[PDB]
Amino acid sequence: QIPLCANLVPVPITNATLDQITGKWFYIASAFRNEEYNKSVQEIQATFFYFTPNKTEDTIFLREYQTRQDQCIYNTTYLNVQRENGTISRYVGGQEHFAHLLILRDTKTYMLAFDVNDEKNWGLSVYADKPETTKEQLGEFYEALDCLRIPKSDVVYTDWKKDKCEPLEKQHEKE
Ligand SMILES: CC(=O)OC[C@H](O)CO
Ligand SMILES: [Cl-]
């Protein structure tokens, strides 16, 4: 009687999948079951970032340009990859958290499903290769939320008009 979620089926990460995610992405939206997670995420006004996989070490080097309180905060870190599980992981508050990487029909968008920990904390984020998207580009994201029974009204979106990091990224590139 519990309908299952075809867009959330894990898919093993290969060297080809690591090439597919190499490059620049924009953070578009998330929604979590935990309300404090939604409110925490609400302070992030925009974020774009670059991934550079290291296939030997099963890591990905992340350079992130986040706008928070109307300024740019730049940070680098390493994510771990669990190839056979289809997950990538990041240390959050000193604990490793895992997410399934789900590359969408259109390889221009992908989602991270945070469905590896306690069920009361599950959530979904979606990313694209441009800062703006259409409702249609987000079809798989909204279907998955419906299937996870997270209402659309809990989604937190970034607002690209608020970005402050394009000026920095531009200088990082001139150098
Ligand atoms: C795995 C995880 O918690 O996050 C991946 C990263 O935050 C998105 O760029
Ligand atoms: Cl689904």
UniProtKB/Swiss-Prot annotation:
Location(s), subcellular: Secreted
PTM text: N-glycosylated. N-glycan heterogeneity at Asn-15: Hex5HexNAc4 (minor), Hex6HexNAc5 (major) and dHex1Hex6HexNAc5 (minor).
Gene giving rise to this polypeptide: ORM1
Glycosylation sites: N15, N38, N54, N75, N85
Cited function: Functions as a transport protein in the blood stream. Binds various ligands in the interior of its beta-barrel domain. Also binds synthetic drugs and influences their distribution and availability in the body. Appears to function in modulating the activity of the immune system during the acute-phase reaction.
Protein name per UniProt: Alpha-1-acid glycoprotein 1
UniProt organism field: Homo sapiens (Human)
Record-linked CDD domains: lipocalin_AGP-like
Tissue expression per record: Expressed by the liver and secreted in plasma.
A Gene Ontology cellular-component term: extracellular exosome
Record comment regarding domains: Contains a beta-barrel that binds various ligands in its interior.
Induction comment from the UniProt entry of this chain: Synthesis is controlled by glucocorticoids, interleukin-1 and interleukin-6, It increases 5- to 50-fold upon inflammation.
Keyword set, alphabetical order: Acute phase, Disulfide bond, Glycoprotein, Pyrrolidone carboxylic acid, Secreted, Signal, Transport
InterPro entries xrefs: A1A_glycop, Calycin, Lipocln_cytosolic_FA-bd_dom
Pyrrolidone carboxylic acid PTM sites in chain numbering: Q1
Pfam families: Lipocalin
